[model samples]
Target: EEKYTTKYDNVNLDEILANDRLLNKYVQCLLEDDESNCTADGKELKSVIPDALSNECAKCNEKQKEGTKKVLKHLINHKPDVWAQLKAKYDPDGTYSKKYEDREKELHQ
Candidate 1:
């Protein structure tokens, strides 16, 4: 699958959190399979579909959000310039440039 690139240079932590929360709610609904209302807190997983898929989505979203926060914090604290370099390098054909190669070397050692 081709990766999608966004022009957004900054990662909004709050938005990411919000998206995860929303996704969790939606997934919970799917798991419940509540005919009355497809909403989180509407029905427990036990009362709905056995072994809900929503739980997995929620877990994955939580993990992704946590990972994103860690990466964003690291970028904010050190080597934010690397982000621009990476975007420039990968924007076209998802390829890295020599500058990125050098940056990676410098970052590693």
Candidate 2:
């Protein structure tokens, strides 16, 4: 099959975790599944979404509810995807690739 550009293409993982509207839309998209008229939840992998914000975190994760919508984004995308897709683009970076590299370079040496 050809490479796919999912609906959430424009919204990278980092961006999704920084915009409530986008994150809500993303979750709604997965839960709606309008074509079938039946929500995905656990029924369809392609239509699956992250779990509840705080619930999924299970107190193990932290998010930013301060600032504004961008801050709220961190609170919404509190769960990790059980799978990966073709169009999940994440172009920006800060600590994502750095912390690990920093740790690896510091330790096991």
Candidate 3:
């Protein structure tokens, strides 16, 4: 099967993490009830998240998989409030988180 488009693989995850404005915008984009405000990359990201969580990024390219891990590590370790909000919205049942729990702990920020 074809993988997700690599158009966003080059997106600078570290830069987004370093910039609160960019990070918040992405968070808002993902959390929006509708995707009207999402940028193209944000929309693409929003589209993949559920599948990525459920299938462990089965469609993600190498870069995206690594980037996802990095972003998740940051959120889980340094941004508990934001993580909680996202978890409530995306992982309310805790099923996904539980599956990733050990792997998440092994990740470094």
Candidate 4:
């Protein structure tokens, strides 16, 4: 059987739960579906912004804006459902948060 790790083993959940600003930023990053921005090794937003613009431009400007707004509306309108999927998959019930904390801990340790 594969071993299951205690997520808190290397995490600092207490700190995240305590900092409203950090927590809000973290949640926003998750909502935006941009996990890369959360990890220490992940590329910065500036680096990915160009790619995002390129992809957006692949479609007609007006169509792209409409399509993006539709997606954003759906996500915002169905936040609970969207959050569930994000928490269960990419973020995995605080895995990203834990990983981030663990990395920070390692740096300071």
Candidate 5:
């Protein structure tokens, strides 16, 4: 498959996750069914999530993959409520979440 855009590779996810307002804006965009309120980057993220999750982020570049892992690690550790909300939205059946749980758990504990 063709790769997703590299435009977001350098987007500074650490900074975003550290700031509540900025992070919430992204979380809202991903959770909402509509994209009208999303910024360009958020919209791009929303669009790619399904494909990325379903296929294990096969289309993601190296930086994207690392960035995703970093975000998941942060959310699972520091922002579990937000992580739960996102998990409910994206992995309602518990399929993809199960796959990542062990790995992420291992990393932290």
Candidate 6:
């Protein structure tokens, strides 16, 4: 069995849980779902934030908004292959897939 590692091991859950945007989203979801009795009358607003904040994260549930420079830098890395991805998508010949497949094999090897 193979276990692929990710940035998860390095991420600080405290920083993620402390994210205000995630807390707000959870509150909105609760109020919208209304199944858990999370209401707009502030029924459980106080506790709800903690519930959301305290919840364990196995995956990257919350991502902070990236700055323009960071976003541009991130996208720059994709530019070289995006055309190939688009070509493969439009053609369906899996033309660009080989590069990814080879990389996957190389990683496993």
Please name the candidate that would achieve the greatest TM-score relative to the true structure: 3
Question: The CA-based lDDT of model 2 is what?
Answer: 0.31
Q: CA lDDT of each candidate?
A: 0.36, 0.31, 0.65, 0.38, 0.65, 0.32
C-alpha lDDT of candidate 5 relative to the true structure:
0.65
Candidate 6 residue-wise lDDT, 1-109, digit = tens: 2333223545432433345443334334333434453333223222322232233222222321122223222222333333233223333664433433343232232
Model 5 per-residue lDDT tens digits across residues 1-109: 5555444546565666687676677777756676567876656555665656877667777756666656666666666666767777778888777666654553343
The sequence of per-residue lDDT tens digits that candidate 3 reaches over residues 1-109 is: 5555444556566766676676777777756676567766656555666666878787677767777767776656665556666777778788776564554453347
Greater lDDT among 3 and 4 belongs to 3
lDDT of 1 by residue, 48-101 (tens): 222122242243334343444343343323444444343342344434233233
The weakest ten consecutive residues by lDDT in model 1 span 45-54
Task: List ranges where model 2 is wrong by over 4 Å.
Answer: 4-11, 32-109
Cα lDDT for residue 86, model 4? 38
For candidate 3, the clash count comes to 0
Pairs of colliding residues, candidate 5:
none
Clash pairs, candidate 6, are none
Candidate 6: where is the Cα deviation over 4 Å?
Answer: 1-12, 33-109
Off by over 4 Å in 4: 1-11, 41-109
Model 1 vs. true fold: TM:
0.23
TM-score of each: 0.23, 0.25, 0.67, 0.25, 0.66, 0.19
RMSD of each: 16.8, 15.4, 5.4, 18.3, 5.0, 18.1
Q: Candidate 4 overall Cα lDDT vs. reference?
A: 0.38
Q: Model 4, range 74-98, lDDT digits (tens) per residue?
A: 3323344443443344434554424
